[PDB]
Ligand binder design. Structure first.
Ligand code: HEA
Ligand code: HEA
Ligand SMILES: CCCCCCCCCCCCCCCC(=O)OC[C@H](COP(=O)([O-])OCC[N+](C)(C)C)OC(=O)CCCCCCCCCCCCCCC
Ligand SMILES: CCCCCCCCCCCCCCCCCCCC(=O)O[C@H](COC(=O)CCCCCCCCCCCCCC)COP(=O)(O)OCCN
Ligand SMILES: CCCCCCCCCCCCCCCCCCCC(=O)O[C@H](COC(=O)CCCCCCCCCCCCCC)COP(=O)(O)OCCN
Ligand SMILES: CCCCCCCCCCCCCCCCCCCC(=O)O[C@H](COC(=O)CCCCCCCCCCCCCC)COP(=O)(O)OCCN
Ligand SMILES: CCCCCCCCCCCCCCCCCCCC(=O)O[C@H](COC(=O)CCCCCCCCCCCCCC)COP(=O)(O)OCCN
Ligand SMILES: CCCCCCCCCCCCCCCC(=O)OC[C@H](COP(=O)(O)OCCN)OC(=O)CCCCCCCCCCCCCCC
Ligand code: CUA
Ligand SMILES: [Ca+2]
Ligand SMILES: [Cu+2]
Ligand SMILES: [Mg+2]
Lengths: 49, 36, 236, 74, 55, 269, 98, 534, 50
């Protein structure tokens, strides 16, 4: 009989790990999807200047 | 543990992305439907 | 510049300090979303998983190792977020070498701008008041509650210094695109220094509550090239 | 051809009420008290004509005349 | 002094505490007369102030 | 003690007070004072006869509140040991709030003193104000107040010791030595060169000492009701809470005066 | 430790003098993070027979089915406990169809 | 009878009076918000003809009625007076006679406020009554004088109430209740009372300075005379920032108690919870001038106030995580109080992130005196303190009154207020980032977009309030029939997995406080023989 | 939600007239002023919401 233990422990770990990973994409899409797009269109008008 | 957790975890991330997109993305509906 | 209908972001920058304001907000917002993504995810999972959980593990209270981490977990993100904040704060007060100073004194319900510099051949200060345009005389094509009859002109590529005060009550000089905001107390003279880098018109408003004419106090400002500023100040 | 008052030690901060006031006091003590030279007194004169609201000058001009000026010009 | 004979009176009185002492009638009756004038007179000037007439 | 007898008494040491009309009578007296004062400031009445009436009713109602407290502590005897600790603790929390009111007045003094305003002179005190001289007359008040703390101390211990001629004499000197402070302070106010209307300097000066002055008049009244209660055999040798809170009040009010003597008198000239 | 855990609830169940205590101990045994060993469950079944409560014996496997977290480990507990369960007479929920 | 309500000494009757005054002022103050939204629905003066006055006056009345007459008497005077003696185990408060004057001076303030509004001038100065605008030259009537007198009455009520709670907690506990072993709500009330005691006198000093300057000619803040209108800002906000914590700390105890009853597992790390609760109160006294960033302070003090205000997030975050750790393992019961608590956990964290975004002095030059700040503090006030007030009512009312409230009709109210308030207060952050200022009655046309959406959402919340009033009526009338039929839920804790239905009916309440063991409604004399603990 | 939106429109009828600047020809004319001054290089200055 396998001593099933710590089901909560790793379930806790994955929950916290996913939260940072899912929050990682949310944070990363803001920086490199939206915010980085804003900088490039900003620089183009200044580049023509 | 990979077999058991897969049946429950991965579907929820898809449901997760839906509700949070509703609470935060609702004003996008008003602007598109008729910014007019 | 002007606000836009159904707009959700900063007005287009025109000063290096507004870019830092824009840049700092995103770096903090880069980290606000991880915490927002963490608390909200744990909220959805716990609600869905353990609402359907009959048995409750009623002996989990101490958590020695976890408590140490999320006690110090915020303490580090506070450290990273606090570096660009401090450099921005201490480079906004660079008044080492400006080129021309403008005073902005507001009488209750309006503004009076006077240029204390004596570059003009008159040798006298140029002062003029700026009233809102009433709805009765709102000429066909003008902006409501935003356009005045007399404006203020500032050259481009110039280090300008602003000194503001008040006469009757507190009223604050404010132009969102440029990132300047000073209280303008009736007895003090607070100062800022901003550099503008592209021609255009910026509109701002009066922020501090000052009576019944609070809404009728716009601050129209536009930037012209260095020559055209000179053929404007002489004629005024 | 643009220039203005430079950064000043002792007055390095946003609040500038004293910087205006001292130039007015310094200017009158530059002239009435040992005004042997015209040129150095103009440094203050271009410094309070700048950075200072106009109506403060007329208020201080009446208070000086009447003898109720808080500053000690002499 | 009189505390012992005042203790026996305040206890076993079956009356409100401000009415137990035999000398209490001298303070209470003149008080309610002045009190009424104090909390009713300012209320008469309220409508006069709303209209703006200054006396 | 029989089980039947013990059930004919309270099972807890806390005091249950009967319903009383004074909490609301004082509440109505505070509205009349608030509503009459707001009118006489701008007219609408004509003379200041209603303000005096409101103050009289406010004071008289407060006297009848204190009149009930002494009755339930001396004749009904509802102040057990536990109740006496709460009253002392409540007064200690009340004097801390009183101190912090003064702390807001020292902050107002240091704001205009450390960096004097430009509409004033470049100095402090402002130009043309003859400030009170710390050595001639206020120094008499300083010695008087210190001696008050020395004569109320042995009046307190003589009451504990058991002799009433020294206890009664200590308060009598204490009362008259506080009245001398009030009359001497009255003399200086009517002989000062500057008024409350003399710019910012008069405002902070007369708000710190004036608030203390109004507190000294309330100290003499508190000392006066302890002389009536001691002479008529109210205060006992081991139970006097109305007197302990008076000794703390006069000792705390001497420290506040010493602080007002260093910054408003010495450091401000 | 797990062995200390098993040997101390093996003693708790042997001392349960009423139907309130049996339902109190089993709510403590299944409240821990670890799934109990099959030796623990056997003693719990004996306790229910001692206080004469059929429905709590049925809920033992119902508690285990949600607790064991594995479809084969429930069968693993099932096989070793066949003899004691059949001897006692406890029916499973699925077999009972209530 | 007159004696029972006019001569009250019982603390529970005073709590009921506090509650009753709170709802009337709550309805009065939430109609001014309706008129404000109707005036801001579209550009141009639509309903109020052109009067810029009677707009600022309405805003002042709304703010004062919502803060000083709804939250203060309900959380502190309503719940604190009724529940602190019962959970501690005291029969009543230490000073039962000043507890009545702590209440009866509140209706006088309402009279002073209404008669201030009815005088021809009015008080259009904001809830922060700044000296130069509210001086005698700009506000020349007796209006702001009467407004100031109301603040004194509220301050004296709060001070006398605060002194009562400190002495009551310190030496009126039962035979086993050591100061170390307290319910968390009592801890919140204790810390709140200590903040009030140290913060109120400075407000009183500043307000009386303003009064004397208007009528007694003292150059306290008059520019002509050497006065400084910025000293008033220091004096007021020294009571101001600590204040935003008197209105949320008792809101923390309610959430702490709610989430550990419908989730059947005790709170994760209680001693750290009380440490963090005390640290927020202690350290909030060191951050008051972040409300004064653009007033012209020194560069180095701005750095100090920026660094000290971010430390607030360290204990606060600890409370957010420890709330998410006590619900991880337990069994969750989704009732109305639990739905309010879960909504609070999300909305208050959304408000706090914007708050930490506002805490940087270099960024606040773009977000100050805009609708950004309004959207911020409407999350922690209208969604952080109001929600815990609704959760507390739905949590304790059947125990206090003895009348149930038709669950399914209350969850509708919850959803309506949720999706109504989110509509009002989420678009504000969009209006603030474009530079829309505060305290204006009419705005440039380009701002007409989100304002219409926010105005539509106010009607939803008003309808939810009307439904709540109907719920109150249906609770007081035929509320005894609600627990006979199947309209409401009777037990707040379902039986455990291996707990039979006939054993749950001998131990019905497994609670960690004396509140739920008392009869419904509790007796007038609750504790004859003292209760024993541990 | 239906009753709130329906009651919102009814009370809107008992209100004042709109501003004279919401004609969609005023808003079209507002753009020529902005476009000549180069109001927004990144982003727009449309000013049209009719
Ligand atoms: C209940 C009311 C309440 C509460 C609780 C708060 C809480 C906070 N507030 Fe404030 N505030 C107000 C009510 C409140 N506030 C009001 C009414 C005003 C305007 C008054 C006026 O001007 O009229 C105001 C204005 C105000 C200002 C001035 C803005 C201005 O005028 O320009 C600032 C400045 O920093 C501020 C900051 C904060 C911070 C940092 C917190 C912190 O306590 C928040 C901390 C929260 C979090 C940190 C999120 C939760 C924690 C986590 C999710 C853990 C993870 C966190 C990290 C990793 C950081 N708010
Ligand atoms: C507790 C404080 C509180 C509450 C509840 C509210 C509730 C609301 N407020 Fe706000 N508001 C302030 C405090 C509050 N407010 C303050 C301090 C200011 C600053 C004023 C100034 O600038 O001087 C302000 C300013 C303010 C403005 C900006 C005004 C300006 O700057 O010019 C607006 C704009 O729409 C607004 C609208 C609303 C609306 C629509 C609601 C509500 O419709 C939102 C939904 C909430 C409810 C409907 C209340 C429900 C609860 C009850 C009625 C109590 C009964 C319930 C129980 C007992 C459980 N109020
Ligand atoms: C979430 C719950 C609902 C939140 C509130 C939604 C409010 C929608 C709204 O106000 O839309 C109104 C606009 C009107 O059209 P407009 O382009 O704004 O033109 C102006 C017309 N007035 C305003 C003068 C009548 O018309 C629209 O744009 C209607 C869009 C409706 C989109 C669906 C609802 C929101 C998403 C769910
Ligand atoms: C914790 C954080 C709390 C919230 C903080 C406040 C939000 C900060 C800004 C983040 C959202 C940015 C969205 C991107 C954006 O602006 O795109 C516009 C969204 O417009 C819309 O109206 C879409 C809104 C959907 C979001 C496109 O449209 P546009 O604004 O250019 O349209 C103008 C027509 N005149
Ligand atoms: C950070 C952000 C946190 C957000 C909220 C998290 C809420 C869930 C908390 C879960 C419980 C934490 C806990 O104490 O569990 C420990 C394991 O945790 C873990 O396994 C977590 C360790 C840290 C993960 C990184 C048990 O600890 P234990 O196994 O020693 O208990 C032996 C007892 N006898
Ligand atoms: C406004 C600020 C008001 C401040 C009031 C402070 C009150 C302090 C005393 C509180 C009660 C103390 C107490 O129980 O003492 C009782 C007498 O005190 C009393 O009855 C003292 C009443 C005299 C106080 C006068 C203060 C000036 C009031 C001005 C108007 C307001 C009798 O207690 P005991 O233990 O001595 O009895 C021994 C019997 N064997
Ligand atoms: C400011 C007012 C004074 C506050 C400080 C004194 C409060 C602590 C002493 C105390 O508990 O006695 C109070 C009497 O003083 C009073 O509160 C009576 C003076 C009221 C002044 C009103 C203006 C309330 O005593 P209690 O009568 O509430 O309870 C009696 C239970 N044995
Ligand atoms: C949110 C988005 C907007 C939703 C709008 C809903 C309109 C009304 C529908 C009512 C339907 C109904 O009644 O739902 C009933 C459901 C199912 O209940 P049941 O399983 O007992 O089955 C019932 C039949 N026997 O219970 C619930 O709601 C409980 C779940 C609520 C979860 C929390 C809600 C509060 C918000 C918290 C913050 C967000 C958390 C996640 C963040 C990403
Ligand atoms: Cu001027 Cu506001
Ligand atoms: Ca309108
Ligand atoms: Cu604050
Ligand atoms: Mg401001």
């Amino acid at each position: 009989i396998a001593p099933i233990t710590g089901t909560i422990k790793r379930r806790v770990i994955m929950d916290i790990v996913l939260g940072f990973s899912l929050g990682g994409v949310m944070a990363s899409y803001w920086w490199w999807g939206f915010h980085m797009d804003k900088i490039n269109k900003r620089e183009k008008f200044y580049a023509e200047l | 543990w990979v077999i058991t957790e897969g049946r429950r975890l991965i579907p929820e991330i898809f449901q997760w992305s839906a509700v949070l997109s509703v609470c935060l993305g609702w004003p996008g509906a008003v602007y598109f439907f008729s910014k007019a | 510049d002007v606000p836009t209908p159904y707009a959700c972001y900063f007005q287009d920058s025109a000063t290096p300090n507004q870019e830092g304001i824009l840049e700092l907000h995103d770096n903090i917002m880069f980290y606000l979303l991880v915490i927002l993504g963490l608390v909200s995810w744990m909220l959805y999972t716990i609600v869905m998983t353990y609402s359907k959980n009959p048995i409750a593990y009623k002996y989990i209270k101490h958590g020695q190792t976890i408590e140490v981490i999320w006690t110090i977990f915020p303490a580090v993100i506070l450290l990273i977020i606090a570096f660009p904040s401090f450099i921005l704060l201490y480079l906004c007060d660079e008044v080492i070498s400006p080129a021309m100073t403008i005073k902005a004194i507001g009488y209750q319900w309006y503004w009076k701008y006077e240029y204390s510099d004596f570059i003009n051949d008159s040798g006298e200060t140029v002062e003029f008041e700026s009233y809102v345009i009433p709805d009765e005389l709102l000429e066909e094509g003008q902006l409501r509650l935003l356009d005045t009859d007399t404006s203020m002109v500032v050259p481009v590529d110039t280090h300008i210094r602003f000194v503001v005060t008040a006469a009757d009550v507190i009223h604050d000089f404010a132009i969102p695109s440029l990132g300047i905001k000073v209280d303008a107390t009736p007895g003090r003279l607070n100062q800022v220094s901003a550099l503008i880098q592209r021609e255009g018109v910026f509109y701002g408003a009066c922020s501090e509550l000052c009576g019944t004419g609070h809404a009728n106090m716009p601050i129209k400002i536009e930037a012209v090239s260095l020559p055209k500023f000179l053929e404007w100040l002489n004629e005024q | 051809p643009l220039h203005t008052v430079g950064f000043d030690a002792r007055f390095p901060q946003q609040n500038q009420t004293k910087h205006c006031w001292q130039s007015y006091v310094d200017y009158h003590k530059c002239v009435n008290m040992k005004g042997e030279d015209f040129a150095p007194c103009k440094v203050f004169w271009k410094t309070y004509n700048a950075l200072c609201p106009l109506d403060w000058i007329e208020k201080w001009d009446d208070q000086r005349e009447k003898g109720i000026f808080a500053g000690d010009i002499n | 002094n009189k505390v012992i004979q005042l203790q026996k009176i305040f206890q076993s009185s079956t009356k409100p505490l401000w009415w137990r002492h035999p000398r209490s009638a001298l303070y209470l009756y003149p008080f309610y007369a002045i009190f009424a004038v104090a909390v009713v007179t300012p209320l008469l000037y309220i409508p006069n102030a709303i209209r703006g007439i200054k006396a | 003690m029989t089980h039947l007898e013990r059930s004919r008494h309270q099972q807890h040491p806390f005091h249950m007070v009967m319903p009383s009309p004074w909490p609301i009578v004082v509440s109505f007296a505070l509205l009349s004072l608030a509503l009459s004062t707001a009118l006489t400031m701008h007219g609408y009445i004509g003379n200041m006869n209603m303000v005096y009436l409101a103050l009289f009713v406010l004071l008289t109602s407060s006297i009848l509140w204190f009149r009930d407290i002494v009755a339930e502590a001396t004749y009904l005897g509802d102040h057990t040991m536990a109740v006496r600790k709460g009253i002392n603790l409540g007064f200690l929390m009340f004097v801390l709030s009183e101190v912090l009111i003064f702390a807001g007045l020292f902050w107002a003094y240091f704001h205009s003193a450390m960096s004097p305003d430009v509409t004033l002179g470049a100095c402090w005190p402002p130009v043309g104000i003859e400030a009170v001289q710390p050595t001639e007359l206020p120094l008499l008040n300083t010695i008087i107040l210190l001696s008050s703390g020395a004569t109320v101390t042995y009046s307190h211990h003589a009451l504990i010791a058991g002799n009433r001629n020294k206890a009664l004499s200590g308060l009598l000197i204490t009362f008259w030595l506080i009245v001398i402070f009030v009359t001497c302070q009255y003399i200086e106010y009517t002989n000062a060169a500057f008024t409350i209307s003399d710019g910012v300097y008069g405002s902070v000066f007369y708000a710190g000492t004036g608030l203390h002055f109004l507190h000294m008049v309330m100290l003499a009244a508190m000392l006066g009701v302890n002389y009536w209660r001691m002479r008529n055999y109210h205060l006992t040798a081991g139970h006097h809470v109305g007197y302990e809170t008076t000794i703390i009040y006069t000792h705390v009010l001497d420290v506040i005066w010493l602080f007002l003597y260093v910054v408003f008198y010495w450091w401000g000239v | 430790t797990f062995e200390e855990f098993t040997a101390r609830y093996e003693k708790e169940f042997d001392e349960a003098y009423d139907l309130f205590e049996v339902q109190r101990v089993l709510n403590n045994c299944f409240s821990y993070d670890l799934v109990p060993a099959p030796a623990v469950i056997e003693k719990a079944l004996r306790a229910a027979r001692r206080v004469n409560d059929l429905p709590t014996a049925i809920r033992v496997f119902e508690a285990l089915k949600y607790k064991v977290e594995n479809e084969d480990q429930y069968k693993a507990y099932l096989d070793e406990l066949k003899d004691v369960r059949q001897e006692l007479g406890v029916p499973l929920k699925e077999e009972l169809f209530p | 009878m007159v004696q029972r309500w006019l001569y009250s000494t019982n603390a529970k009757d005073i709590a009921v009076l506090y509650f009753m005054l709170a709802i009337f002022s709550g309805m009065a103050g939430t109609a001014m918000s309706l008129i404000i939204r109707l005036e801001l629905a579209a550009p141009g003066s639509q309903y109020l003809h052109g009067n810029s006055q009677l707009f600022n006056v309405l805003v002042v009345g709304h703010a004062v009625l919502m803060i000083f007459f709804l939250v203060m008497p309900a959380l502190i005077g309503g719940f604190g007076n009724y529940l602190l003696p019962l959970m501690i185990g005291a029969t009543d408060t230490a000073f039962p006679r000043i507890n009545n004057i702590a209440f009866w001076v509140l209706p006088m303030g309402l009279v002073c406020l209404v008669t201030s509004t009815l005088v021809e001038s009015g008080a259009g100065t904001g809830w922060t009554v700044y000296p130069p605008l509210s001086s005698i030259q700009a506000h020349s009537g007796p209006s702001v004088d009467l407004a100031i007198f109301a603040l004194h009455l509220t301050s004296i009520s709060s001070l006398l109430g605060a002194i009562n709670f400190i002495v009551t907690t310190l030496n009126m506990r039962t035979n086993g209740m050591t100061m170390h072993k307290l319910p968390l709500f009592v801890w919140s009330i204790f810390i709140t009372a200590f903040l009030l005691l140290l913060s109120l006198p400075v407000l009183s000093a500043g307000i009386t300075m303003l009064l004397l300057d208007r009528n007694f000619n003292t150059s306290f803040f008059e520019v002509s005379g050497g006065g400084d209108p910025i000293l008033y800002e220091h004096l007021f906000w020294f009571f101001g920032h600590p204040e935003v914590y008197i209105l949320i700390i008792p809101g923390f105890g309610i959430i702490s108690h709610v989430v550990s009853t419908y989730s059947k597992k005790p709170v994760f790390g209680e001693i750290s919870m009380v440490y963090a609760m005390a640290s927020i109160g202690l350290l909030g006294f060191l951050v008051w001038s972040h409300h004064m960033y653009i007033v012209g302070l020194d560069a180095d003090t701005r750095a100090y106030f920026t660094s000290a205000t971010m430390i607030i997030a360290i204990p606060t975050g600890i409370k957010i995580f420890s709330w998410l750790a006590t619900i991880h393992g337990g069994s969750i019961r989704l009732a109305t109080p639990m739905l309010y608590a879960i909504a609070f956990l999300f909305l208050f964290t959304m408000g706090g992130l914007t708050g930490v975004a506002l805490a940087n002095a270099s960024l606040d030059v773009a977000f100050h005196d805009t609708y950004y700040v309004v959207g911020h503090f409407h999350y922690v006030l209208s969604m952080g303190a109001i929600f815990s007030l609704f959760a507390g009512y739905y949590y304790w009312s059947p125990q206090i009154l003895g009348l149930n409230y038709n669950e399914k009709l209350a969850q509708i109210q919850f959803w309506l207020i949720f999706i109504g308030a989110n509509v009002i207060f989420f678009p504000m952050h969009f209006l603030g980032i474009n530079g829309m200022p505060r305290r204006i009655p009419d705005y440039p046309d380009a701002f007409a977009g989100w304002n219409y959406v926010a105005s539509i959402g106010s009607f939803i919340a008003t309808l939810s309030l009307f439904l709540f009033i109907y719920i109150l009526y249906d609770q007081l009338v035929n509320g005894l029939n609600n627990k006979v039929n199947n309209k409401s839920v009777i037990y707040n804790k379902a039986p455990d997995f291996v707990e039979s239905n006939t054993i749950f009916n001998l131990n019905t309440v497994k609670s960690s406080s004396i509140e739920f063991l008392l009869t419904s409604p509790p007796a007038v004399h609750s504790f004859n023989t003292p209760a024993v603990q541990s | 939600l239906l009753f709130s939106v329906g009651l919102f429109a009814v009370v809107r009828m008992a209100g004042g007239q709109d501003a004279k600047t919401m004609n969609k020809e005023w808003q079209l004319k507002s753009d020529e002023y902005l476009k000549s001054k180069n109001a927004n290089p990144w982003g727009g200055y449309s000013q049209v919401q009719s």
